[PDB]
Amino acid sequence: YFQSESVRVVVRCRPMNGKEKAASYDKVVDVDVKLGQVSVKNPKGTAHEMPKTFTFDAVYDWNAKQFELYDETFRPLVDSVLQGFNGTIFAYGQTGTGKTYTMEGIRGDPEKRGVIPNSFDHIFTHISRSQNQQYLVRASYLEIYQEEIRDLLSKDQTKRLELKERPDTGVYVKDLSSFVTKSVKEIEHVMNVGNQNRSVGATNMNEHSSRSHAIFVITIECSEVGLDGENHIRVGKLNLVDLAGSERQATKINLSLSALGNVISALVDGKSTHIPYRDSKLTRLLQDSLGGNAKTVMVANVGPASYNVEETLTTLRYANRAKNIKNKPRVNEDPKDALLREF
Amino acid sequence: ESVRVVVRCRPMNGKEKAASYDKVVDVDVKLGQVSVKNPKGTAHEMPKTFTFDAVYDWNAKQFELYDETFRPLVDSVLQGFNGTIFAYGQTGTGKTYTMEGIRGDPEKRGVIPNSFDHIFTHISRSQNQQYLVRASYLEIYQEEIRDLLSKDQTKRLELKERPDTGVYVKDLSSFVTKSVKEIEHVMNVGNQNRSVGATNMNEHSSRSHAIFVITIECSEENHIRVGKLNLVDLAGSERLKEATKINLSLSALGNVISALVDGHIPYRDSKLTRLLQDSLGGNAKTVMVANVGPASYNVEETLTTLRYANRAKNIKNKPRVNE
Ligand SMILES: Nc1ncnc2c1ncn2[C@@H]1O[C@H](COP(=O)(O)OP(=O)(O)O)[C@@H](O)[C@H]1O
Ligand SMILES: Nc1ncnc2c1ncn2[C@@H]1O[C@H](COP(=O)(O)OP(=O)(O)O)[C@@H](O)[C@H]1O
Ligand SMILES: [Mg+2]
Ligand SMILES: [Mg+2]
């Protein structure tokens, strides 16, 4: 061995909510933070079946704080992008479990803001602290819905963008818009406009956002004179992904979710198996995040109630598979696509 | 009735002349056209030419625009229609000049004060009619509404809806105005309040939307008509962009206009588009003023404005007397 890297997988179980309490659902999910374990009871108990237990890199219970999640699990990933790695954070699980609460949270609120806005603060504070380093940060924001890509930052919300792929390039979204951002205020405003554009259709956003994938992309370039006196540029891409609801697995089947499951499963079956990246826009776009040149963290969001036990178990099984995925991340050094080369 | 669209091109300024920029915008009042030429000329490339309801060059005076374009709109509000006039275009092109103008020279007064004069002189001449005129003044900045007339400038107001009359700004202050002097005072009060909290007033006013609202009730079977006149001065208007001019209300405005002219209209997506819902495809007459500058330096933004304005001409409204 040479001192590759596993996809990091964490589970977060949200509090039982008022609707669930009012319906008298039982709490069947138990989280053991010390052991990094989640146990799921059968709603009929051991009179029917024994409980299922899973182990993860870390687990977070109903009392987990947004900022502690951040510092323990997400910060090192963001750190890596600040040093020129590609990094991906994705939230997976059933509608209503807390993917968006985890990814976006309550912006403007330091206690309740999620990983995206925490990453903004981390990134720009890091930049302002640095010396003898030049940074350029820019953001894109896109939605995948019905296997088409919509640029949430574009003035034209009717156009759909195509994925292209070259040996020079890797896969990329052709003609995707990007905003250069110099501060937290600027990148927050980028997210505001994308979120506003996201609702351009009639279907209520609760339903629409459940049925689509949102990907916020922070590209961080850094230029610094090395000990060899040469100007070295590194470029890392931080993909921050809030997936469609995991229950959506004919038109009810989300093809990017289904492809994601097959990719995860193929990557960990222990065989030389075909990995079907091309079977969806999501898995094509995130190909490096799943077996490739990136560091990746998966947050598997679940809720505690007996009523949702089946979807919870589905989530936990995929999460348990994903933790065996091996990536091979590298610092992305002096790439041809670097805007900082202009200066 | 279609949204009326006019273009106004300001004079070349001193800095532009000093930098030796070419004048690339030509205006033909006879054809109602504006032409953007290549400095290399027609042996190289043809000008981009657009047609509008009216066009006004750098020499056109405030009162020419008023009597030709704005007056019929204000006439309609005096007859019980909703009417809207909005100024759109690049920062520095003349939106504010057109809407507010400059007080000290009567000839330089913009559509807002000119409308005051027209409305109150009309009312003073009226036989067999009773008018009541009310004014409100608000700003939209960062998708929040500030009442420019309230004492507390830290408060923000929500939009609510009534089942018959539609959207309104909850708790917005409204002054009854009996004269030009009273309504001008309301404008002066609001324009003072606008700079409250601004780090740079010119940048702030370029990034926000100002909406002066005149509600004209007329009593004259007993008829009561009510028409709302919205007078709007908008924010300035891999694909790499800069985050600093992001304007959430303008984004929404674009999506609304696109959906209206394509052959769901997302009015609810922003404060501006909810307030302007009637003005854009609804129960109002509407005039758009597309402001542009003449210099070669700004040509791409000028063209973007003209294309935007060209599309807006296609919006179909359904104005009724509100009786
Ligand atoms: N850890 C948590 N603590 C408190 N409230 C939460 C938590 N996770 C989710 N919620 C709440 O539950 C609701 C559903 O969460 P959301 O993130 O929208 O679900 P989805 O997984 O569908 O995006 C929201 O009202 C959100 O505030
Ligand atoms: N038609 C015009 N004639 C003369 N000066 C003008 C005209 N339009 C604008 N200006 C002047 O040009 C400058 C910028 O105009 P302004 O209305 O402030 O632009 P905007 O509101 O579009 O940013 C101001 O000094 C203004 O008085
Ligand atoms: Mg969600
Ligand atoms: Mg102005």
From Swiss-Prot, chain A:
> Where on this chain does ATP bind?
G93, Q94, T95, G96, T97, G98, K99, T100
Location in the cell reads: Cytoplasm, Cytoskeleton; Cell projection, Cilium; Cell projection, Dendritic spine
User: What residues does the Kinesin motor domain cover?
Assistant: 6-325
Disulfide links within the chain? none
Q: What does this protein do?
A: Microtubule-based molecular motor that transport intracellular cargos, such as vesicles, organelles and protein complexes. Uses ATP hydrolysis to generate force to bind and move along the microtubule. Plays a role in cilia formation. Involved in photoreceptor integrity and opsin trafficking in rod photoreceptors. Transports vesicles containing N-methyl-D-aspartate (NMDA) receptor subunit GRIN2A into neuronal dendrites.
What is annotated about its quaternary structure and interactions?
Heterodimer of KIF3A and KIF3B. KIF3A/KIF3B heterodimer interacts with KIFAP3 forming a heterotrimeric (KIF3A/KIF3B/KIFAP3) complex. Interacts directly with IFT20. Interacts with the SMC3 subunit of the cohesin complex. Interacts with FLCN.
- Report the disease annotation for this entry: Retinitis pigmentosa 89: A form of retinitis pigmentosa, a retinal dystrophy belonging to the group of pigmentary retinopathies. Retinitis pigmentosa is characterized by retinal pigment deposits visible on fundus examination and primary loss of rod photoreceptor cells followed by secondary loss of cone photoreceptors. Patients typically have night vision blindness and loss of midperipheral visual field. RP89 is an autosomal dominant form associated with features of ciliopathy, including postaxial polydactyly, and renal and hepatic disease.
Q: Which family does it belong to?
A: Belongs to the TRAFAC class myosin-kinesin ATPase superfamily. Kinesin family. Kinesin II subfamily.
Write down what this protein is called.
Answer: Kinesin-like protein KIF3B
Q: Can you name the source organism? A: Homo sapiens (Human)
Q: Which residues of the full protein are shown?
A: 7 to 358 of 747
